[PDB]
Amino acid sequence: GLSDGEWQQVLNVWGKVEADIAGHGQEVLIRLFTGHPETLEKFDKFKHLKTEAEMKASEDLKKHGTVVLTALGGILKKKGHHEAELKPLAQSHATKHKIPIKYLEFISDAIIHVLHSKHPGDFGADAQGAMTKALELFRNDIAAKYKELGFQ
């Protein structure tokens, strides 16, 4: 549950992402894969990437970063009223992709890391607080659907 002022911070931060969605999405995925190499094994289309240089050169990885961040941005712009947008993603990630909730924690922290890396000194403590809360709400509502489905 976020206040109006917290949502305002989230959507202000998101404007930074929307100025370069592909670059942010690329770096989020690279941070996930290099920090947590088990996550790479869930992507049949990326498992061939062995080095970070290959990851950086991959246009399909940048494409997937755009898909991921476009979906998250659509959810965030709903300010918590995201049941319709979130349900299909929870279902596909539990039943088809088999993504444990832990990996959604990993990508949440990776988003925070990338924002500080690309905008050092321009991602203030209030903005980090609000973004973190928004990602926790996203993860918590996915977790509820995972529990319904019995997925671990």
CB of 47 to ligand HEM, least distance (A): 10
Q: Does 97 belong to an annotated binding site?
A: no
Q: Does 24 belong to an annotated binding site?
A: no
- Please select the residue that binds ligand HEM; options are 45, 47, 63, 147, rule is CB under 6 A: 45
Q: Tell me: does residue 101 bind ligand HEM (CB under 6 A).
A: no
The H or E element containing residue 4 is: helix 4-18
- Please select the residue that binds ligand HEM; options are 11, 23, 34, 43, rule is CB under 6 A: 43
Q: Are 53 and 61 in contact (CB under 8 A)?
A: no
Q: Tell me: does residue 151 bind ligand HEM (CB under 6 A).
A: no
CB of 56 to ligand HEM, least distance (A): 18
Residue corresponding to tokens 């917290």? 6
The H or E element containing residue 53 is: helix 52-57
| DSSP assignment string, 67-98 | HHHHHHHHHHTTTT--HHHHHHHHHHHHHTS-
Distance CA(134)–CA(39), nearest Å, equals 22
Footprint on this chain of ligand HEM (rule: CB under 6 A): 39, 42-43, 45, 67-68, 71-72, 89, 92-93, 97, 99, 103-104, 107
Annotated binding site for heme b: 93
